Amino acid sequence: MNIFEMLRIDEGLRLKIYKDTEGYYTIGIGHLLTKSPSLNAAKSELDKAIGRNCNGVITKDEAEKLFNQDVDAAVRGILRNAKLKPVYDSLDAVRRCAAINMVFQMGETGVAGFTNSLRMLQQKRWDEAAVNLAKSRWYNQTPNRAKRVITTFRTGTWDAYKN
Numbered sequence: 001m002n003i004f005e006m007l008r009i010d011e012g013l014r015l016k017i018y019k020d021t022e023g024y025y026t027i028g029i030g031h032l033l034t035k036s037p038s039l040n041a042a043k044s045e046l047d048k049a050i051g052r053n054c055n056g057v058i059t060k061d062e063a064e065k066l067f068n069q070d071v072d073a074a075v076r077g078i079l080r081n082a083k084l085k086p087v088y089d090s091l092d093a094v095r096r097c098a099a100i101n102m103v104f105q106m107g108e109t110g111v112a113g114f115t116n117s118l119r120m121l122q123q124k125r126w127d128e129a130a131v132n133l134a135k136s137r138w139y140n141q142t143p144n145r146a147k148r149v150i151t152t153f154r155t156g157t158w159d160a161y162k163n
């Protein structure tokens with residue numbers, strides 16, 4: 001397992017515009033298009049992202065390329081962030097995947113309230129971090145996915161994804 005396989009499991013693959021768990025237009029492997037309620041706005045974002053007139057539909061190759069760009073953007077966002085980078089660099093490779101997963105799902109802004117969780121992770125207080133991570137809108141709104149990510153932080157194994 002690696003970050004691509006992990007997020008492919010968590011996000012699925014859909015080749016036509018769909019709505020994410022928050023109701024926002026999305027495509028591919030969890031690629032957010034827009035928070036606007038306008039499907040036309042989402043279609044414009046899609047065409048800009050792919051470089052052709054897509055009519056709301058992409059190929060698997062295009063979905064996988066967007067996904068690679070999105071994973072890389074999450075990593076670079078962590079590495080450019082003075083609060084996230086030191087914690088990320090303190091983690092082992094499996095837990096770094098859990099970190100990328102959260103930033104992919106919520107962005108840097110969405111993880112801003114996780115200050116106490118970040119401290120517990122940097123301190124390697126895994127059980128305490130797991131308890132703290134679950135006290136979140138994130139966990140309450142997407143509990144099965146959050147449980148998998150939290151188990152990855154708690155154990156440093158892929159057990160939640162193999163199971």
Ligand SMILES: CCCCc1cccs1
Binds near residue numbers: 078103
């Ligand atoms: C709990 C904060 C979101 C995930 C992480 C980013 C960097 C280290 S952990």
